[PDB]
Amino acid sequence: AAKTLGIGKAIAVLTSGGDAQGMNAAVRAVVRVGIFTGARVFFVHEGYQGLVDGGDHIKEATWESVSMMLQLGGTVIGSARCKDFREREGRLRAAYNLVKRGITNLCVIGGDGSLTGADTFRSEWSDLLSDLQKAGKITDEEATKSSYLNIVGLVGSIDNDFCGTDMTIGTDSALHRIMEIVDAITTTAQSHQRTFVLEVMGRHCGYLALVTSLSCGADWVFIPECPPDDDWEEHLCRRLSETRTRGSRLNIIIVAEGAIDKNGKPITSEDIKNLVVKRLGYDTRVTVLGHVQRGGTPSAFDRILGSRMGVEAVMALLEGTPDTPACVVSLSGNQAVRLPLMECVQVTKDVTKAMDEKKFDEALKLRGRSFMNNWEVYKLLAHVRPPVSKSGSHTVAVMNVGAPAAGMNAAVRSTVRIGLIQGNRVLVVHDGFEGLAKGQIEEAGWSYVGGWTGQGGSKLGTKRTLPKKSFEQISANITKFNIQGLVIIGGFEAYTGGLELMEGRKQFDELCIPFVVIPATVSNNVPGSDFSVGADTALNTICTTCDRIKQSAAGTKRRVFIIETMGGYCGYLATMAGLAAGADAAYIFEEPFTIRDLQANVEHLVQKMKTTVKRGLVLRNEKCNENYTTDFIFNLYSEEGKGIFDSRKNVLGHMQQGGSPTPFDRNFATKMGAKAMNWMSGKIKESYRNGRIFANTPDSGCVLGMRKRALVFQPVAELKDQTDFEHRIPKEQWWLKLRPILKILAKY
Amino acid sequence: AAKTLGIGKAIAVLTSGGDAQGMNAAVRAVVRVGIFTGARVFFVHEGYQGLVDGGDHIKEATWESVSMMLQLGGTVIGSARCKDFREREGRLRAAYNLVKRGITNLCVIGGDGSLTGADTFRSEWSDLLSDLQKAGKITDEEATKSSYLNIVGLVGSIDNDFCGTDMTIGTDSALHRIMEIVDAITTTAQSHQRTFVLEVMGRHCGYLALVTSLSCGADWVFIPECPPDDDWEEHLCRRLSETRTRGSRLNIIIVAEGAIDKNGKPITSEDIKNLVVKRLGYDTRVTVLGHVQRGGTPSAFDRILGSRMGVEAVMALLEGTPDTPACVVSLSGNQAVRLPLMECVQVTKDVTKAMDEKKFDEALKLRGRSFMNNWEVYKLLAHVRPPVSKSGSHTVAVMNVGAPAAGMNAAVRSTVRIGLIQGNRVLVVHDGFEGLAKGQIEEAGWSYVGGWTGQGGSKLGTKRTLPKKSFEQISANITKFNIQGLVIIGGFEAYTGGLELMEGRKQFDELCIPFVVIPATVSNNVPGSDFSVGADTALNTICTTCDRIKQSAAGTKRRVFIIETMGGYCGYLATMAGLAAGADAAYIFEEPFTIRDLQANVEHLVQKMKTTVKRGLVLRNEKCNENYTTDFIFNLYSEEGKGIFDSRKNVLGHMQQGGSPTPFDRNFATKMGAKAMNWMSGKIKESYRNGRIFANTPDSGCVLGMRKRALVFQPVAELKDQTDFEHRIPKEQWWLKLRPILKILAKY
C-alpha cells in the first residue's frame, strides 16, 4: 500500500499476436509499473515461443530497457507464431520455464487468438503441475506456486474485433494509416472519374472498414457482419453513376477483407473492380493496403491507451488471488476495467459462430451498440438523395462559435444531413453569433456539406463573440428566417454563449427555443464532456512535433527540450502530449507547482542526463503559472544542467489548428452531429404548442458530452457550478487521474 | 568562534559630538553586529547625557530598531552637549547607570572632544568603583565587573581633524554638500566678474577647505595650519586680477573657518570680501555654508565606511581584555585598524599646540603626508603662470582609453599642468589609441585644461580600441610628434592596451618609451588598484536612485525591488551599492550562487516582508550568472512573494556615466595625474641615452594603483597573472571581504 505490494513477486510479459502499434507502450507501462510496485519484470522475446523455448528467450527487464519505446510501432520484445503452444506438448515446457524462473504473474498482450491461448493456459494449469511433477523439477516448488497462476489479457489487435474492450491497441494508428492513404488518394483525383476500391484489413470484423468509410465518405462499403443481401451490384452502380451526374470526381468503395455476400461466397475487391468496369466502365483502381496498416508510428491515443492498460494489467496481476479468475484489462466508457477472460473469449467467439450461420442480424447485434450506429449513420450520410420537402417542417440552424477546430465541418456535415433526413429544414450560419446577428444565414441543401467530413478548419466561419450584447438583432433574425432551434458547434464560448442564451429567454420570447452545444475545441476545456472535437488532432500535432524535435542538428549529444504547449489554462494537451511523448515533466495549471518541486524535477532529470538518458523532454502548459514562465523553467533547467547537458526552448504556440481532422475527430464530430440533431428534433416537437414554439424548460438548452460509457445531454445551467469561469475550464477533469502515471513513467 | 563570542556580554552605544552623516550607519552596524555576536545592545539617547542621566535615556536596541538608518543624515540615537560628563560629578553617575544596567562595553561615536572624554573616562574608571562603593550599589558588583571596562572610539566628525584615521564619518558627504553648492554657484556666474568667497567649516583643520578647493579650482584658499605669512593681499588681488585678464568670469576664494594670519589675528571671510572690493572692486559675495555641511544624506562612502568601523568597534569590544588599552577604530590604507585611544588623543592634540605657537611647519607636518601633498598640488594647479619654455624638454602625451568616467578630465588636467610645470611638453590625444594612430594630436598649453577638474565625461575623447593592430601608424606618429612617454587614463583596455604596448617593444623601437596607466573606469575592474576613478561617482549614482526607487507610487505598501547594476563582471558596484543601500541581496559574479541558495535568499526576504520590512531591495550584477538572469531572479522573487508582497524590476543600465565627478574622484583623478607625470618624468630621464630614449625595462610600463596605505606603480606584465582576462577583472578583489558584512546586515 503500496510500493510494497509486488515485493516478493515477479512478472513476465509477452507480446503475442500480430504487430499492433502501441503494444510497445503497453509493455513499457507494464514494466515500469511492475518494477515500481516492488516486483521484478521479465521479458519474453518472440511471443508464446520464447515462453515455450525459454533460456535466452526470457530476459529480465530493466527500467532503461523500456526507454524510447512509446513512439516505436510494432513489438520490440518480439512477436512470433509459436504453434507448439496450441498443443499441450509445448504448454508444459512453457509452464516449466515459468516455475523454473520462479514466476506467478503473466502479461499477454495480443489479439483474439493470443488471449484465448492464454485463457486455456490458465484453465489447463492445475494439471500441468502434477504432470511436470513425474520428472520436471522438485515437488517443493509445486507446493509453493499452486493455484497461484495470474494472467492478464491485454487486448492488442488492429482488428478491434475483441469484444469486451471499447478499443484495442493500434486500432487508432491503423485508422490513421488508412486515413493518410485515402487523404492522399482523395486529394489528387482530378482527371478522370477515378473510382478507387481500397480493401482494408478485417478478417471477421467490419470495424476499420466502416470507420474509415465514415471518415472518408466512402461511396460504398462491404463488411462481414452485414453482407449486401440480394441484388446490390445494380444498387452500387446505380449509385456510382447516380453519383457521377450529380457531378462528382472520385469514388471510394471501401472493402473489408472478410467481405462476403448474402450466402457467403466472398466479395472480392477485384470482382468489384471488374463489375464497375464491366458495368459502368470508369477507370477503376484496386489498392490492397495490407500490412502497412500495422506500420508507421502509434497515434497519441494508442500510446496513451497502452500506458493505461499496461498499468491496469500490473494492478490486476498483483491483486490476483487463487480464487480470482483469469483477467482481461480493457477500456469501457473511458475507464479501465478488469473483464473476465473466459467470458470475453467465449463471447468474442459467439460472434464468429453467429456470423457462420446466416444470422447476420445476431452478428450485427453481438457487435452492436456503437457499431450498429456507425453503420446506420454512415449509410444515412452516404446516401445520394435526400427526401421530399414538406412545409410543416421545423427549421434548424447550425453554427460555429469559438476558436476553430478539426471536425467542425464534420459535425456541420452530419447535423444538416441528419437534419434534412428527418425532412426538416437546416439553416447554416456564417461566423458564430455574429451570424444570427448580421443575418448571414443561408439554407443548406444536402450538397452544401458534400465532402466536408475530412476538411479541417471551419467552413462556415467561427467567431468567439457572444450573443447577449446583441440579443435584439438575433431575436429579430430568429423570427425573420424562422429559426426554431440552435445547434452550436464550438469551444467554451459556445457553452458560455449557451448560458448567455438561457438568460435571454427571460427577456425575449424568441430565444425560448431549444439549443445543443456540441463541444468543438482544441483545448478540451468544455465542461460536461470528457473529450472535445479537435483535441485528438491538436494532440497528435503536438505529439508529432515533440518527436521530430527529439532529434535536432545538435553539435553534440546530451540535450534538453523545454516545450510550451497551448490550451489556455487546461493542461489536457500538455498532460496528454506529455505522456504520449514521455516527458520528464508536464507542468500544468490544475496541478500547481512550487519552485521547491520545480527544483527537484530538475535535480532529477540531471541525474538521468548524467546517465541513461541522452535526450530530455520538459512540457509546459502555456499558463500553468504566471511567474515560472517558459523562460524561467528553461533558464532554470539550463543552469542546473550546465556542462551535464545542452538545452533549447520551443514554443509551439497555435500552429495553424485548421489543418486536417484525425479519423477520431471526424467520427466524433459526425456521431454527435447526428446525435444532437435527433435529440433536437424531439425537443422542438415537445415545445410546439400554439403555432409557436416555446422552450422555457432547462432541458431544451444543453451541451452534449462524453461522460463515461455514454454520450449525455446536460443543461448548460446544470453545469454552471461544475465550471470555473475565471480560467474557462471545468472543475474536475477526468485526466488528472493520469498525472501520477505520467510521473512514475518518468521514474519519480 | 563565533556567534558564541559576545554571549553573556552587553554593549551600549552612544553618539556624542556634532552630527556627522553616517554615524547612523556606524550605529546600525554596531547594533546588528553586536546582536549577531550573541551580545545584547543598548542605545544611549542624547550623547553622553543619556549616559549621565540614565533611566529612560538608555533603551535596549532591537534589530528592527536600526532598520532604515543607513540613508538618514545626522544621529537618530540622539546627540546632545552634556557638560556634566566633563566633570567627575557626572562621570560617576554614568558609571552607576552602567554597572546598574550591567554593562562592560561602550561604543562612543564622536569627534576629538567626544573621543577624549571617553579616554579620560576609561582611565578614571578604576577609582569610580571604589568611590561609587561608599554608597552606590552592592560591592558584589565591583568584584564582577572590575578592570573590565571596554570602550571603542569610533571617529565621527565632519572636520577630518582626528589623526590616526585616514577618514572620519561624514567627511565625504560634507564634501558633497560643499561641492553641490559650488557646483551650483560655479555654473551660473555668467554676468559680472563675480568673486564668491565661500567660508567653510574647520575649526583647526584645513582639510575640507583644501579638498574643496582642490575639487573646485578655488582661486585662493585660507587654512589654519599654514597661514599666509606676510603681504598676501597684494598677492591675492594681484592674482584675482592676473586671473581677470587672462579672461575669467568667476573666482572662488575658499576660506576655512579657523582662518588665521601669520601672527594669529584671524582672517575674516568678510574682511577678505572687503579687501577685494576696496582693492579690486569686483562684485564680491560672501557665503557661509555653516551647519548645512552637516546636512543632507550620507555619501555612499560614508554609509560604507560607517558599517566598517561599526563592525570593527564590535570586534574590538568583544576582543577586549583587562590588560588591553582603550581602543579607537579607524581606517588606514583602506584597512580597518584598532589604534590606541590615548596616543590618538595625545597626538591629535599635539597639532593644536604645535599650531598655537607660531611653528606652522610642525603643524603642517603633524597633519602631513597626503595633506601636505594636496596643499602642494593644489597651489601648483592653482597657479596663474606657467613657466618659461626650453627645447631639451621631454614631450609627454596624455590620452583617454576605454569607457569614459567621471574624473578623466581631472586627471588630464593635473597631468598636463604638472607636466608643463616641470617645463616639459605635453601633447594631448583625442580618442584613445585611435589617437596616436590617425594623428589627432595637439599641444596642450596651461589653459587647455582650465577648469576641467569638475567637468564630467571625457574632454579629449576616449575609445576602447587597442594599439596593436595599428602599431605601424602609432610608432610612425610617436616619431613625427616626437612623443616620448604615454600617460593613459582609462579602464581595462588601458591596462590591456598597456600590455599590448609592451609586446610592441619587441617589434618596434619607438614604443620603447615609458607609459603610465591611470585607472579610470566606472566598474573598478582594473587590476593593481583598490579603486578606480569614476567608481565613487557611479556608485553614488546607483546608491541614489536605489533610494529614490525605495518609494514608488505603489497602490499599496509591501513591495520588492529587483535592480540590475552595471559593471560587466565586476561585482564592485552591485556589492557596494548593495551595502550602501542595505539590500537583502546583491548577486555578484565573483560569488557564484546556486538556485539552492537563491531559493533560501527568498524563503527569507518573504519571512521579513511578512513582518518587519515593508520595502525590499534585491541587487543583481548584470552578469553574475548567465541563466539566473534579471528576469529569473525577478519572477522567482515574484511568485514566492505572491500575496505577501508586490514586486517591480528595474534595470538601471548605464545611465549616462558622463555626468559630473564627486569630489573624491576629482581629487583621486587629480592626485594621480600629478603622481604619474612626476614618476614619468623620472622614467624618461633614466631611459635617455644617446639622443634617443630607450625604455625596454618592465619598470617603464606601469599601472599606478591603490594598494593598501600607498599608491603604487606596478608593471603591467607583473599584473598579468593577477588578472582574469576572460572576464576582464582582477583576481582577488579586496571588497569581497565585505560580502559577509552585507550579509549579516541583512540578517543571515
From Swiss-Prot, chains A, B:
Reactions catalysed: beta-D-fructose 6-phosphate + ATP = beta-D-fructose 1,6-bisphosphate + ADP + H(+)
UniProt-annotated catalytic positions: 159 (proton acceptor)
Disulfide bond sites: none
Renumbered residue ranges of the record's region N-terminal catalytic PFK domain 1: 1-383
Sugar-modified residues: 523
Binding site for Mg(2+): 112
First-listed, main subcellular location of the protein, grouped into a coarse class: cytoplasm
Keywords from the UniProt entry: Acetylation, Allosteric enzyme, ATP-binding, Cytoplasm, Disease variant, Glycogen storage disease, Glycolysis, Glycoprotein, Hydroxylation, Kinase, Magnesium, Metal-binding, Nucleotide-binding, Phosphoprotein, Transferase
Regulation: Allosterically activated by ADP, AMP, or fructose 2,6-bisphosphate, and allosterically inhibited by ATP or citrate.
Biological processes, Gene Ontology terms: canonical glycolysis; fructose 1,6-bisphosphate metabolic process; fructose 6-phosphate metabolic process; glucose homeostasis; glycogen catabolic process; glycolysis from storage polysaccharide through glucose-1-phosphate; glycolytic process; glycolytic process through fructose-6-phosphate
Post-translational modification: GlcNAcylation decreases enzyme activity.
Binding-site residues, beta-D-fructose 2,6-bisphosphate: 464, 521-525, 559, 566-568, 622, 648, 654-657, 728
Cofactor: Mg(2+)
Enzyme class label: transferase
Disease named in the record: Glycogen storage disease 7: A metabolic disorder characterized by exercise intolerance with associated nausea and vomiting, muscle cramping, exertional myopathy and compensated hemolysis. Short bursts of intense activity are particularly difficult. Severe muscle cramps and myoglobinuria develop after vigorous exercise.
PANTHER family: ATP-DEPENDENT 6-PHOSPHOFRUCTOKINASE, MUSCLE TYPE, PHOSPHOFRUCTOKINASE
Free-text function comment from the UniProt entry: Catalyzes the phosphorylation of D-fructose 6-phosphate to fructose 1,6-bisphosphate by ATP, the first committing step of glycolysis.
Further information: In human PFK exists as a system of 3 types of subunits, PFKM (muscle), PFKL (liver) and PFKP (platelet) isoenzymes.
Subunit and partners: Homo- and heterotetramers. Phosphofructokinase (PFK) enzyme functions as a tetramer composed of different combinations of 3 types of subunits, called PFKM (where M stands for Muscle), PFKL (Liver) and PFKP (Platelet). The composition of the PFK tetramer differs according to the tissue type it is present in. In muscles, it is composed of 4 PFKM subunits (also called M4). In the liver, the predominant form is a tetramer of PFKL subunits (L4). In erythrocytes, both PFKM and PFKL subunits randomly tetramerize to form M4, L4 and other combinations (ML3, M2L2, M3L).
Name this polypeptide is given: ATP-dependent 6-phosphofructokinase, muscle type
Lineage of the species this protein comes from: Eukaryota, Metazoa, Chordata, Craniata, Vertebrata
